[PDB]
């Protein structure tokens, strides 16, 4: 994450992020809606940060220091580049919408009125198709990665020293290889809960309520399609074991 965005999302809520004099001018329902919208972006910023740790810190770090088979790193972090591109684009779109809404002369005060339109674009068409297939591939290759991580850590001392080293900082407490992998799988299932809670405070504009209703249906359709296309892979699953 970049310092600019970290300081912009360092507060617990939108009410704590905006200046108290700016907050005072808004209604109850609006403060409520903006707190949840702020959370959708805050968690998205964090999601992208997780994929950066996986790609730059672990995936690349291994390629350069640990000289092992290239399919081992692919087996450890499947589709991370593809995933990073989907979420870095979504995060940019969400961050631009916040920036547009910034009050003149302020870097912290804003109100996002339109969001359902940006969410309908994200969860529909080629963007949705690229997201569904990428999460289906990631999730079906999830267990095989956890087993490959454990095989390496409990068989290679160089891998052990690398992991111990790169995970040593206090900031990597929640972000070990496996925790990053589960954090990614669990992300897609956070959207319906975030969008429904936003939708709960978006009745002031009827076209915004319908946008968030459609966007909710689109994330739910997507989640069902990823779930339907999941078949767990096993490191050395024999052909007989698969077709039975």
């Amino acid at each position: 994450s970049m310092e600019m965005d970290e300081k912009d999302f360092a507060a617990d809520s939108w009410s704590l992020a905006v200046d108290s004099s700016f907050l005072q001018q808004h209604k109850k329902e609006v403060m409520k809606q903006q707190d949840v919208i702020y959370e959708l972006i805050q968690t998205e910023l964090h999601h992208v940060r997780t994929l950066k740790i996986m790609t730059r810190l672990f995936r690349t770090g291994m390629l350069e220091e640990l000289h092992l088979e290239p399919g081992v790193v692919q087996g450890l972090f499947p589709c991370v580049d593809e995933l990073s591109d989907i979420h870095t684009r979504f995060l940019s779109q969400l961050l631009e919408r916040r920036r547009q809404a910034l009050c003149p002369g302020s870097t912290r005060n804003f109100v996002i009125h339109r969001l359902g339109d940006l969410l309908i674009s994200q969860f529909s068409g080629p963007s949705a198709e690229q997201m569904c297939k990428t999460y289906s591939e990631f999730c079906s290759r999830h267990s095989k990665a956890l087993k490959l991580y454990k095989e390496l850590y409990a068989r290679d001392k160089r891998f052990q020293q690398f992991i111990r080293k790169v995970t040593r900082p206090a900031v990597l407490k929640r972000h070990g290889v496996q925790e990053c992998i589960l954090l990614v799988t669990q992300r897609i299932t956070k959207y319906p809960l975030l969008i429904s809670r936003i939708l709960q405070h978006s009745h002031g504009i009827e076209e915004e309520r319908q946008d968030l209703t459609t966007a909710l249906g689109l994330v739910k359709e997507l989640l069902s399609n990823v779930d339907e296309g999941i078949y767990q892979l096993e490191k050395g699953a024999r052909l007989q074991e698969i077709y039975n």
């Binding site: 809520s13 009410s15 968690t43 589960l182 669990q186 299932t189 975030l194 779930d227 339907e228």
Partner: protein, 179 residues
């Protein structure tokens, strides 16, 4: 330091996300109660042992039968959660959640946790539950369910009042440190 992993399961209306947040936070969500929980690694010292405890949630996964079990690998303790102001969430423990946790996680200690115990003396809870011929989950009904499903133990807490929350997580750490 020993690394142990916790996972909370149970119907949405049991208050599992709130429980995780109120525990993980040194503060209390006074201004904003987050909708979601990412993960947390708690530093716990129970009975002289110092454990690192990764806390995980299954909220959002309830309808996705192949996505939900991906949270289970390497779990050292399970919190099986239900709401005291909701007898329906207790009835789904041995029918839905117990068969699944025993399938993916055989021999992993389960702790039955009765959340929202502060609502057992609330009158709005009695008034609305009378409309469905129901009444708050009695202590003995929770203990008897924990017994029936082979739970390691049965506990009760209130994430709104923080009552019994530290105890649940200290006990889950003892359960995870077993055999």
């Amino acid at each position: 330091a020993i690394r142990k992993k916790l996972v909370i399961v149970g119907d949405g209306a049991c208050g599992k996300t709130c429980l995780l947040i109120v525990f993980s936070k040194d503060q209390f969500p006074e201004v904003y109660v987050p909708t979601v929980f990412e993960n947390y690694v708690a530093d716990i010292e129970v009975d002289g042992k110092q454990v690192e405890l990764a806390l995980w949630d299954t909220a959002g996964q309830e309808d996705y039968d192949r996505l939900r079990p991906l949270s289970y690998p390497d779990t050292d303790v399970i919190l099986m959660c239900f709401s005291i102001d909701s007898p329906d969430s207790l009835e789904n423990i041995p029918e839905k959640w117990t068969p699944e946790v025993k399938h993916f996680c055989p021999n992993v200690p389960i702790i039955l946790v009765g959340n929202k115990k502060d609502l057992r003396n609330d009158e709005h809870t009695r008034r609305e539950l009378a409309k469905m011929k129901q009444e708050p989950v009695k202590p003995e009904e929770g203990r008897d369910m924990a017994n029936r499903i082979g739970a390691f133990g049965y506990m009760e807490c209130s994430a709104k009042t923080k009552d019994g929350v530290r105890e649940v997580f200290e006990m889950a750490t003892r359960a995870a440190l077993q055999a």
